[PDB]
Write a protein that binds this ligand. Sequence first.
Ligand SMILES: CCCCCCCCCCCCCCCCCC(=O)OC[C@H](COP(=O)(O)OCCN)OC(=O)CCCCCCCCCCCCCCCCC
Ligand SMILES: CCCCCCCCCCCCCCCCCC(=O)OC[C@H](COP(=O)(O)OCCN)OC(=O)CCCCCCCCCCCCCCCCC
Ligand SMILES: CCCCCCCCCCCC(=O)OC[C@H](COP(=O)(O)OCC[N+](C)(C)C)OC(=O)CCCCCCCCCCC
Ligand SMILES: CCCCCCCCCCCC(=O)OC[C@H](COP(=O)(O)OCC[N+](C)(C)C)OC(=O)CCCCCCCCCCC
Lengths: 491, 506, 90, 205, 158, 61
Amino acid sequence: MLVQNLIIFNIIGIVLLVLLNNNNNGILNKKSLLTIKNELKLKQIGLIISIINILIIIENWIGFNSNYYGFQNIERFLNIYWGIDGISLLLVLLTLILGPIAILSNWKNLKGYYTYYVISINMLVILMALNFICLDLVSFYILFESTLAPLFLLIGIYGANNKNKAAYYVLIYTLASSLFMLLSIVIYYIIINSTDYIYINNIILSINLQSLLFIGIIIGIAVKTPLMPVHTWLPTVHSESPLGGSILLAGVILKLAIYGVIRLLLPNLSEISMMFTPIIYIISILTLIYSSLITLKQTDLKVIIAYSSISHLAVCMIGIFANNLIGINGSLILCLAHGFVSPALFILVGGILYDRYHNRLINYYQGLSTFMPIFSIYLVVFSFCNTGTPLSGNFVGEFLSITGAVIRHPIIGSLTAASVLLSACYQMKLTNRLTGSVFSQYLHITNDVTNREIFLLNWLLIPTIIIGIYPSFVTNILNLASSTLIYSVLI
Amino acid sequence: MLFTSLLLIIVYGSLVNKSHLLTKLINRLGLIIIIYTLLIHLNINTLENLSIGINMFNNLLLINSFNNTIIELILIICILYVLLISFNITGLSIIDNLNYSKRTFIVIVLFNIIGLTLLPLVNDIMILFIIIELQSYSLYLLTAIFNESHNSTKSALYYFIVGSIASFIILDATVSIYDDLGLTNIQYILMYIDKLEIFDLLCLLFGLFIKIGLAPFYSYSITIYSLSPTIITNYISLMPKLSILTLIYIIMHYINIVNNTDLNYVISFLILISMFIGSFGGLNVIRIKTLLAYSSLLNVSYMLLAILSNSNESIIAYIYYIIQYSLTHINIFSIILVISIYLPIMNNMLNVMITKYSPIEYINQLKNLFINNIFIAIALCISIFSLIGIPPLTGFYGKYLVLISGLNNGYVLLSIVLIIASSISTVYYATILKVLSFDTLSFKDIISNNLIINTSPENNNNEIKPEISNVISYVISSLTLIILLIIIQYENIVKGAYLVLLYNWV
Amino acid sequence: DHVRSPNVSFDDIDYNNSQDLHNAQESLLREQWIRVSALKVCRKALESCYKTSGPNHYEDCREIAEKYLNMLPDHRIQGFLGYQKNDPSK
Amino acid sequence: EQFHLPQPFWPTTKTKEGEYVPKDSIREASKVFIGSGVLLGGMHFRRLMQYKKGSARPGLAKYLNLFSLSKSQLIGFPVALGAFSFLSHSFANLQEGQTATGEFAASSIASLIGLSIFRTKKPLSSNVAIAVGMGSLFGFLTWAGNFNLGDNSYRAALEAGNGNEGGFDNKVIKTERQGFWEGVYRRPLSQTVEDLGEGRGIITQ
Amino acid sequence: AFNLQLEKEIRSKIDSLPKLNNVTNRKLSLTDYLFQNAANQALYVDNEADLKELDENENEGWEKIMYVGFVPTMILIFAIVLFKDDKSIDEWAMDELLLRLKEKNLSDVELIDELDKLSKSHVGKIGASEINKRDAVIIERILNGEYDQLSGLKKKEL
Amino acid sequence: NIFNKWNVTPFVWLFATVGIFQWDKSHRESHDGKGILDFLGEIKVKESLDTYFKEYQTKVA
Ligand SMILES: CCCCCCCCCCCCCCCCCC(=O)OC[C@H](COP(=O)(O)OCCN)OC(=O)CCCCCCCCCCCCCCCCC
Ligand SMILES: CCCCCCCCCCCCCCCCCC(=O)OC[C@H](COP(=O)(O)OCCN)OC(=O)CCCCCCCCCCCCCCCCC
Ligand SMILES: CCCCCCCCCCCC(=O)OC[C@H](COP(=O)(O)OCC[N+](C)(C)C)OC(=O)CCCCCCCCCCC
Ligand SMILES: CCCCCCCCCCCC(=O)OC[C@H](COP(=O)(O)OCC[N+](C)(C)C)OC(=O)CCCCCCCCCCC
């Protein structure tokens, strides 16, 4: 009643848009009415499709039991079993919420082919959402890499000047690494004859084989979070992909790596995850520290936002690999909070400034609060949210992730507290420059934030504050599901 | 059915007058012959009855369930190929009349189909030499069917010499086995599998490796495929691999009885080199058929890893991979032939010369296909993403099953290498996709009144005239959706592969 | 209504029975959350004792404070994977 | 107490102490050096005859130039291969077996020895980078288990009863460590302490 | 309402002006995008490009969709996290601890009195709080008795 | 205008949320604690869910 309805409705939605727009393509030299106002009636139908997708998961949410251990809403479809637990439920909701937001971001800033863009966006949202509700490794990998084909074409068609380089980076970095994860999946299907989540969690493999499987899986995950030193693709992709592509990539795709740790490493390779935890912390701590310092020297406006996501997800990787409930819950809270603040920073940079001046260099902008006060209000508020200031969901996620890290490793896990200072260093230096001093001599006075851009910023800000002030909305769902991932024998 | 109908077509073609219309109608007669052959073969041959294996013609031929599946695949793929020459591919006389110019086109194809089907069935070293030459000679004639083309005759000359050397190696291997044992029947030879020089069978495989363009003998295959016409390259680059790879699997099945580790290492060494050349070779090329030739070499290497393992999972992997690769091979070449109608007409720098035999010869000739025909461009994109291995397309499951057999049998080095080679080959695969679509938004507001299709006269200015004929467009539509929607019926198809037995039984 | 834990031990089941294994995992988790609930109640006693005692909190809440510090290292969620996959007797 | 680090190493057949009869490094290396020199030298003279057979045919000359080796290459190649054979056998005897570390050292040093002969007109650091690259490839080759795992594969383990064909049983606990490809339902707690150690949640808090 | 004659009047005024860059009561029904023929459709589009050329950031076509479909959807999500009968595992464990308190000390008259008058909404508020309630004996029994059975599930020791 | 489109909206959400909150508070006193959203459906229980799990693990095995 979930995956069957979600796939069938969206497939029908894809067919409906294709039939309408491509009916008169037969060298008719026609004008037609669907294409009037930049294909408004075709963008509207796709926007309605994204909204309905949210209602589909809400109907199943009503029947969700937070006191039930194990997967719920178990369903067989396409010879694949699908299920939902506490962790999967929240990540699906975040993915579907960003659907309409991504479409609304590129409402009237594309040079054409809106129908192709709308179908690609909705296809990506569903494929990523389905990746949270699959119950085997093979189905996980199929949806993990199926998003590459729509995303490669989306970046190469609607991208910026260097779209060709960005399309090659995302296609090759995320495929060459995921193939190493496929090797570990193939090994599971050879020695156990199954890749089911429940089946493989109860099997203990040899300590040498678990080391080989962990390395294969972690390569695909580490590239996708991303972690240093396999992170160089992400700044290029964000700086060239369209705004809607950046929102999905920053808001959903990077969260699949954290969810991949939950499904593919913790419950099935528990013994080797404990051994690898010091190594993961060292890589993630250096990823956090180095990315913050590298961000201080960047001149591209959208690249600065791209590096900020790397530092935050390093905290998520640190928290999710802590062997206590505090670190695990905090990592999941930070992923949800990052799923809203990070797209907003791209919207402010790549959707408001870029759509007016079309230049992403930092030297052209200063003193924007003089003639764009509404823009500066959101820019300052989202800057403090991105830095982990309290009352925002990022602070709840960061504090619990740091606390869980210290509980897991008091000595080296204490270094995660440097995110409080380092994140404010690069984020505020950008915000202080964009709002301080006199208005830029290289800019002409133009419109402030419009109603459409106000809507995008407000409804990304609201979930962050609600989670920040009352995170018990999220913790209650996660507590039973997250408690299963802990491996300890206290005697 | 094939032999009897071939003789009738030979006599009939030489009696009626020489014309393009009669040749096309004779091509349709050949289509009916292959369809009738498929119906007769399906009526008498079943998977369950052939599981044990049945000898024929004084044990010179041996048919089992593994052999029968490939024969059915060979007939089906040949049906789709005849549709190219039995119907219009572009609807333009200046382009399509090349297929109707040679009357012996359908005759030579029927000669080769007999060789292709009987080759996996060989049970004697004498008939093995006879059939492999019957298949080889038919390929030389088809490569030289356009005898007015300098490149076609040059390629056939190259094809003849390389294949003749391979045939000599095959003959030299079989003669050496006869000297050691004195027996010609394979089943009799299997009685002495532990007392004959097993490296003589490696000499036999070396001759077969040449005929499939395996490294280090890859060079001639790439040269021949690029020079030959697209209608000829579509056949000679796929059909020989359907039969020879099946025969190689049977020979490797017999070799694994003694399990010579040295034999496996030599074949592993050739597979390793073929993945290096197959991946890095296509990175710097400008011809589409040259790119596909490297793609063909790489994919054969993937299948050889399954063949080398030679286990129960290998049967599932090989049967699935060969079927889906053939459908992708047909789909890509079908699109290439059609999209020649969107080529701009000059009305110069680099003095580029394009002939009627290969209207599409460079990768950049596929520019603006997203604008020219969005449905055809997506169909090509689906096919290319299948060759890359993007799930849930047919290509991913082929590589997924090959990896299962490779890692189960302990080929860790080859499995890791095949995945690095897949990533390297994705670079030139993505280049095709870049040419198709990456300039759509800048060329959307462009005017193209100089395309080839624009030269086609209209009927009455009110008839809705399709740009593509009914048959070729339907085949592309069917093959594209089968590649795309394999997840719907993937579970049942593999269950069919579960029942294909090569003397497994229990 | 208030559904109760289906008390089941990993030492009295066969892991091949997926239902019995599922109950053992759930039963162990539910007992660990009761310990956390007990720890929070005991901490509430310490908080109430500290406020009312004032400068007498060292003496009035001595036993309560000692009990809290002893239970704290182990009155937390530990999961089931550790005990499911390990045999202490060996 | 050594650190508890992961061991991503494929299974290898081990020889007990007293086994592993050492390999004669000099004799094995001399066969490669002499054999390579005769073939490379022999083919060089043969290719010279092909040049003299005809020098007015551009097609023949183009292919002969590709296969032609310079004098330094004709000397460098047998020395590099000979050094590779010696170091690979010499390092294997020291460790009582062939390891990726020894093959990385044998390949990198031998390649650098060869590179210094036929690549003289290049910077030394350029030859070091290639030697590291060449050595890493053969180290990866040994780490992967050469071209095949052989009797250490899962298929070999499955035939020997070391696989997972019989299912799993939690009521049976094996004191000895399981096979490389073998999976179990429940493991001894002592083995977990051996792999991870006491500390962050094992036994003690 | 297509109003074909309205486009005829509009087009004439545009055609009356040979120069360019030198009506409000107009709409389209859903059937206009699918049932209109070629002759009528082409007239609307030619007018629309010219009329738009004769010319802030309003009536973009998204307002009705988002404020009817998206915003109420977010309200429903807010309602679910607020007013749904969800018992989290920690909330269940608190009730179980008090239930096991009753089931182990059924002979204590004082304990039963406080539990009966301890309302469900105040079950999870044990301790110092604004609510005037008697729970001192409830806390005292918990401080003296271990009501968890974790040792019972662990029947194997070192 | 102090009662414009932008000033009124935040206050409307507060009034609607508090009014519904009190409505839910009153709805639980007379319905044994059941909330206002009980009309949409009910939370599924372990007994029925485990039946799906048992059949799910049977097919996987
Ligand atoms: C953190 C993310 C990491 C992701 C990437 C991980 C892999 C990184 C690989 C690092 C090595 C490549 C990068 C450095 C190579 C640079 C090449 C170069 O600089 O020039 C090519 C070189 C000749 O040098 P030259 O042409 O004169 O250039 C001027 C130099 N001053 O030409 C040479 O001399 C090269 C040596 C000859 C070619 C050797 C080829 C043997 C095989 C190499 C491995 C291929 C394995 C493929 C496996 C699948 C196919 C089998
Ligand atoms: C002594 C007899 C000859 C040696 C045997 C050659 C045949 C077997 C090799 C198989 C590949 C066949 C390639 C075609 C035959 C090579 C003919 C040749 O030697 O030409 C040399 C060619 C041109 O060299 P060039 O420097 O440009 O011209 C010299 C002018 N003075 O230089 C080349 O580019 C040729 C090299 C082709 C690339 C082959 C690479 C194979 C893969 C090697 C790496 C393995 C990949 C996996 C790595 C990890 C393994 C664990
Ligand atoms: C969940 C399962 C979905 C699978 C099927 C999806 C539809 C496939 C396309 C068929 C219809 C078509 O090609 O139509 C084209 C449509 C409509 O675009 P348009 O602007 O009207 O076209 C231009 C014509 N103009 C200019 C006259 C208006 O655009 C698309 O290509 C969108 C869908 C494909 C996105 C991803 C492509 C790569 C897929 C790789 C899969 C691994
Ligand atoms: C284990 C984790 C793996 C992570 C991914 C590995 C690295 C990916 C590199 C992206 C390449 C790319 O994008 O291909 C596109 C680039 C284009 O280069 P460009 O950006 O235009 O600049 C260069 C062009 N110039 C100089 C003109 C400005 O062509 C290449 O480089 C071609 C070779 C790519 C081979 C990748 C194979 C990887 C094998 C698997 C890992 C051993």
